[PDB]
Amino acid sequence: SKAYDVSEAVALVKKTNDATVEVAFRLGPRKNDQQIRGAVVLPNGTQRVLVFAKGEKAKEAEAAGADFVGDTDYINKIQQGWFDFDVIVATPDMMGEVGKIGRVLGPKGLMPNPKTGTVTFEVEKAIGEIKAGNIHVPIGKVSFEDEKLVENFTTMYDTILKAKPAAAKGVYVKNVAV
Amino acid sequence: KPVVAIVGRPNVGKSTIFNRIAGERISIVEDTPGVTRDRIYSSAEWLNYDFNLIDTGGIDIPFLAQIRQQAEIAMDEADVIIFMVNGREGVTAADEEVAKILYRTKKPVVLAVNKLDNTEMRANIYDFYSLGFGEPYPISGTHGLGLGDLLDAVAEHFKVIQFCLIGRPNVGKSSLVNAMLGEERVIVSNVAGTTRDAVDTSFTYNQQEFVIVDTAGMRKKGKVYETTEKYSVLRALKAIDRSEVVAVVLDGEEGIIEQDKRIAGYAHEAGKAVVIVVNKWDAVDKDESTMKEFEENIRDHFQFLDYAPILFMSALTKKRIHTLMPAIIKASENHSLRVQTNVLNDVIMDAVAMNPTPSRLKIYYATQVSVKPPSFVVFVNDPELMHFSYERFLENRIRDAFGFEGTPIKIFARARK
RNA sequence: UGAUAUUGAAUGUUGGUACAGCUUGUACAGGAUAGGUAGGAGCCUGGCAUCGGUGGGAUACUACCCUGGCUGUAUUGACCUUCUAACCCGCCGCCCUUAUCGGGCGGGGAGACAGUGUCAGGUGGGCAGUUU
RNA sequence: GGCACAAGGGAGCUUGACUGCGAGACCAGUCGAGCAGGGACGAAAGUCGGGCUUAGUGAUCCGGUGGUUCCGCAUGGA
Ligand SMILES: Nc1nc2c(ncn2[C@@H]2O[C@H](COP(=O)(O)OP(=O)(O)NP(=O)(O)O)[C@@H](O)[C@H]2O)c(=O)[nH]1
Ligand SMILES: Nc1nc2c(ncn2[C@@H]2O[C@H](COP(=O)(O)OP(=O)(O)NP(=O)(O)O)[C@@H](O)[C@H]2O)c(=O)[nH]1
Known part of the structure; x- marks a missing residue:
C-alpha cells in the first residue's frame, strides 16, 4: 500500500534477489505522435555486437571491440541458420539492402532503424557506447552498491523527462515499478 | 471476379489511392472524422483486364462500430487486402490493433506505405518488418509513385x-x-x-x-x-x-x-x-x-x-x-417512347380546332426528335406568337391522347423556315 | 422545440465523472479452451512440489500500465413525488384618500412552473431589398 | 479537294512522338529552317515533336495541376 522512496528501494532490491534490477514505467495511440521510446548511454552501467559496416567504416569497426563485421554480405549465411547473439547495428547505406534482403529481424527485435541512434556513420562511437506505450530499461544488477542504481534511475528519468513529449498536457507520470 | 479491399486507420489517404486507381469517386478531405462511412465498389485492371476494388472507412477504438463491421465484411470477399499505412509517422498502436484482424485473417495481405512523395525520403521504408508481413512498397497519391510495383504485388496473388x-x-x-x-x-x-x-x-x-x-x-x-x-x-x-x-x-x-x-x-x-x-x-x-x-x-x-x-x-x-x-x-x-409521326399530327389539329385562339399563330407541322425525353417540334409562322399558356395546353392534349405517365415532356418551336 | 440565468429545500429512484481496493481478457501448442504488457533466485501445508517445455510468451519468482466487470470514497447530474421563502395575481379586507390610477400591511391562489435577457429549424409571399 | 516517290495501312525499333533557344513568316494565336546539349534509333547515310487541311464550351473573378534562400516578424521557432 505504501509508495517507497528511491533511496529505500535501491537498498531493498538488494533483498529482492546474481539477478538484474530492472525498472518499469507506465507512460501517459492517442499520443503515439509524441510517444516515448528510446536509448541512452548509462552511468553506473556482456554483449556481443555484430556490425554491418560498409566501405571504409569497417576499418574502424574491427578495433573498437566488435566480434564479427562481415564480408560485406553474409545475409546468405543468415539465411537457413543464424543463431543471432546480442545486438545488431548497421550503417545508413546498406540498411535498405539488408532490410529487404534480410527477412529475419521483425519478430526478433534487431532490425536496424535510425530512430534509435544505432544506424550512423560513427560506428566506432556506436560500438563503444552500447557495450501499449511502455518502455523497459535494464539499469543494473543486484550486486551493485546503493549509490549506483540511484544515478541509473536518475539518468533514465531525466532522459525520459528531458524528453518531455509534445502534447505535454495532461499528466505524464503514471507508475514507477522498480 | 477478383476483389481487393483497402483498410487502415483514418487519415492515411486510402480513398486518395482508391481514386487515382481510376477516376475520382470518393470524397477526399483532411480531417480525423471525414472518412467514407461505408463500403463502395468499383472495377480495375492491370494486364489482366479483370479486377474489382472496394473502399471502406478508417478503423479505431460517435459511430465507429458500424464502420468496423463494414471493414470486417469487406475483408471477407477481398482476395488480397492491401493494407496501407502512413510512412512519415512510422508506426502506431492503432496500426497494431488493425494488424490484429489481419493476423486473425487467413488471407494473403500486401503492405503499402503512403506519404512518400520524393526520392530521397522514399528510403524510409524500414522497421515495418516488425508487422510480420512481406515487403512494403512506396506510394504517393500526389505524384503516383511506385504504383507499378504495388499493382504487380497485387497481381502476383491473382487467381440495365x-x-x-x-x-x-x-x-x-x-x-x-x-x-x-x-x-x-x-x-x-x-x-x-x-x-x-x-x-x-x-x-x-x-x-x-x-x-x-x-x-x-x-x-x-x-x-x-x-x-x-x-x-x-x-x-x-x-x-x-x-x-x-x-x-x-x-x-x-x-x-x-x-x-x-x-x-x-x-x-x-x-x-x-x-x-x-x-x-x-x-x-x-x-x-x-x-x-x-x-x-x-x-x-x-x-x-x-x-x-x-x-x-x-x-x-x-x-x-x-x-x-x-x-x-x-x-x-x-x-x-x-416514340409515337408515330402520322398519328401525332392527326391529334394536333383536333386540339387547335376546338380551341381556335392562337396575327393569328399558324400550326403547320409536328413531329418527334428524341426518345428520352420525348421532344417535339412544331413548325409555325413565328415562335414569338407562342404563349406559355398555349404551350402548356399542347402538352396536356398529348399527355391525354396517350399515356405518357411518369415522365416530363418538352416542346420546341421552329419558325416558318 | 432546445440550452443557459433569474432559481430552494426533503426523502425515493438515480447514472456519469474522478480517486481507490478486488476480479475478466479464452494464442495450434499449452499445466483445466484460467490477458497483452517489464519475465527466469520456491513446497511438504490435504497433497504432492522444484528444470524445462512443437510453443511469439512457464516464473527453480523478481517484477508496470491497460480492457471489460464487482465492491467503497467524493463530485456532480438526471429525474420523480412533496413542501416553502423568491417570482406572478384583471382575488378579498384596512390605510394613504374623498379615488375601477398607484403604493404599503394583512389573508387567499399558484408555486422553481410560468414570465423575462443571450445562443438552432421550420413556419409562413407574415413584412421588406432585388432584377430576369 | 487532294496524296503515286503516296497524306491509307502496320509495326521490329515502339520514341529525336523529349529534351534549350530560335533567325524568318502568316495571321489574338499559328507556321518554321536553323539549332545547343544529350542521341530513339538505322549498320551507315540519315530521319527528328505522330489524326490530310481540317470548328471540338470560356475570359469575368480568377480557386487545384511540379517543387525548390523563392523570402521578411525586435531577432530565432512555427
Ligand atoms: N502529402 C501528401 N498528402 C497526401 C497524400 N495522399 C493523401 N494525402 C492527404 O491525406 C488526406 C486524407 O486522405 P483521404 O484519401 O481523404 O483519406 P480518408 O478519407 O480518411 N480515407 P481512409 O480513412 O480510409 O484512409 C488528403 O486530404 C490529402 O491531403 C500523399 O501522397 N502526400
Ligand atoms: N418510423 C420510422 N422510422 C424510420 C423508418 N426508416 C428509418 N427510420 C428511422 O429514422 C432514421 C432514418 O434513418 P436513415 O435511413 O439513415 O435516413 P436518412 O438519413 O435520410 N438516409 P441516409 O443515412 O442515407 O442519409 C433512423 O433513425 C431510422 O431508425 C421508417 O420507415 N419508419
Whole structure:
C-alpha cells in the first residue's frame, strides 16, 4: 500500500534477489505522435555486437571491440541458420539492402532503424557506447552498491523527462515499478 | 471476379489511392472524422483486364462500430487486402490493433506505405518488418509513385437501368434501400447526415438487372455553410446525371416542407422520370380518408409534376415495399417512347380546332426528335406568337391522347423556315 | 422545440465523472479452451512440489500500465413525488384618500412552473431589398 | 479537294512522338529552317515533336495541376 522512496528501494532490491534490477514505467495511440521510446548511454552501467559496416567504416569497426563485421554480405549465411547473439547495428547505406534482403529481424527485435541512434556513420562511437506505450530499461544488477542504481534511475528519468513529449498536457507520470 | 479491399486507420489517404486507381469517386478531405462511412465498389485492371476494388472507412477504438463491421465484411470477399499505412509517422498502436484482424485473417495481405512523395525520403521504408508481413512498397497519391510495383504485388496473388434516390435528410432513405435489397449495405443512424457520398450496387429483379444509388440527403442552400463537408452534395447531384429514374422520398409523420418542392425541381429540370415516394407511415394514423388527406395535399402543392405516380410504403414495418419496382418498370418505358409521326399530327389539329385562339399563330407541322425525353417540334409562322399558356395546353392534349405517365415532356418551336 | 440565468429545500429512484481496493481478457501448442504488457533466485501445508517445455510468451519468482466487470470514497447530474421563502395575481379586507390610477400591511391562489435577457429549424409571399 | 516517290495501312525499333533557344513568316494565336546539349534509333547515310487541311464550351473573378534562400516578424521557432 505504501509508495517507497528511491533511496529505500535501491537498498531493498538488494533483498529482492546474481539477478538484474530492472525498472518499469507506465507512460501517459492517442499520443503515439509524441510517444516515448528510446536509448541512452548509462552511468553506473556482456554483449556481443555484430556490425554491418560498409566501405571504409569497417576499418574502424574491427578495433573498437566488435566480434564479427562481415564480408560485406553474409545475409546468405543468415539465411537457413543464424543463431543471432546480442545486438545488431548497421550503417545508413546498406540498411535498405539488408532490410529487404534480410527477412529475419521483425519478430526478433534487431532490425536496424535510425530512430534509435544505432544506424550512423560513427560506428566506432556506436560500438563503444552500447557495450501499449511502455518502455523497459535494464539499469543494473543486484550486486551493485546503493549509490549506483540511484544515478541509473536518475539518468533514465531525466532522459525520459528531458524528453518531455509534445502534447505535454495532461499528466505524464503514471507508475514507477522498480 | 477478383476483389481487393483497402483498410487502415483514418487519415492515411486510402480513398486518395482508391481514386487515382481510376477516376475520382470518393470524397477526399483532411480531417480525423471525414472518412467514407461505408463500403463502395468499383472495377480495375492491370494486364489482366479483370479486377474489382472496394473502399471502406478508417478503423479505431460517435459511430465507429458500424464502420468496423463494414471493414470486417469487406475483408471477407477481398482476395488480397492491401493494407496501407502512413510512412512519415512510422508506426502506431492503432496500426497494431488493425494488424490484429489481419493476423486473425487467413488471407494473403500486401503492405503499402503512403506519404512518400520524393526520392530521397522514399528510403524510409524500414522497421515495418516488425508487422510480420512481406515487403512494403512506396506510394504517393500526389505524384503516383511506385504504383507499378504495388499493382504487380497485387497481381502476383491473382487467381440495365439505373435509378436514384433523393430527399431531405432523415427520411429513411438508407433504411429504405437496405430494407429492399434485403440486406445490410448502407449505414443507418438517428442523426442526420449518416451517408457521405453515393453508394452503388447492382442486382437482378424478375430476370432484370438494376442499379440503385443513395445520395445522403440534401438540405437548404442558404444554411449549408459547412466546413467543406457539403462538398458531398456535388457528388449527389452527379448521380442524377447518370441516373434515368428518380425516386423522391417524403416523411409521412411530418407535413410537406418547402425544401421538398425545391429538391424535386432538380429532377424535373433534368428531364428524368420521377416517382414521388413517401415513407414512415408507421408514425401517422392509417385509416380511411387518411389516404386522400396527403394524396390530395400533394397534388395541391406539387402542381408542376403531375405525371408522377404516388406510392406509399414504410421501410420500418416493410409494408407494400415490393410494390415500388412495379412503379419503376412502368416508368422505365414511358421515359423512352416514340409515337408515330402520322398519328401525332392527326391529334394536333383536333386540339387547335376546338380551341381556335392562337396575327393569328399558324400550326403547320409536328413531329418527334428524341426518345428520352420525348421532344417535339412544331413548325409555325413565328415562335414569338407562342404563349406559355398555349404551350402548356399542347402538352396536356398529348399527355391525354396517350399515356405518357411518369415522365416530363418538352416542346420546341421552329419558325416558318 | 432546445440550452443557459433569474432559481430552494426533503426523502425515493438515480447514472456519469474522478480517486481507490478486488476480479475478466479464452494464442495450434499449452499445466483445466484460467490477458497483452517489464519475465527466469520456491513446497511438504490435504497433497504432492522444484528444470524445462512443437510453443511469439512457464516464473527453480523478481517484477508496470491497460480492457471489460464487482465492491467503497467524493463530485456532480438526471429525474420523480412533496413542501416553502423568491417570482406572478384583471382575488378579498384596512390605510394613504374623498379615488375601477398607484403604493404599503394583512389573508387567499399558484408555486422553481410560468414570465423575462443571450445562443438552432421550420413556419409562413407574415413584412421588406432585388432584377430576369 | 487532294496524296503515286503516296497524306491509307502496320509495326521490329515502339520514341529525336523529349529534351534549350530560335533567325524568318502568316495571321489574338499559328507556321518554321536553323539549332545547343544529350542521341530513339538505322549498320551507315540519315530521319527528328505522330489524326490530310481540317470548328471540338470560356475570359469575368480568377480557386487545384511540379517543387525548390523563392523570402521578411525586435531577432530565432512555427
Ligand atoms: N502529402 C501528401 N498528402 C497526401 C497524400 N495522399 C493523401 N494525402 C492527404 O491525406 C488526406 C486524407 O486522405 P483521404 O484519401 O481523404 O483519406 P480518408 O478519407 O480518411 N480515407 P481512409 O480513412 O480510409 O484512409 C488528403 O486530404 C490529402 O491531403 C500523399 O501522397 N502526400
Ligand atoms: N418510423 C420510422 N422510422 C424510420 C423508418 N426508416 C428509418 N427510420 C428511422 O429514422 C432514421 C432514418 O434513418 P436513415 O435511413 O439513415 O435516413 P436518412 O438519413 O435520410 N438516409 P441516409 O443515412 O442515407 O442519409 C433512423 O433513425 C431510422 O431508425 C421508417 O420507415 N419508419
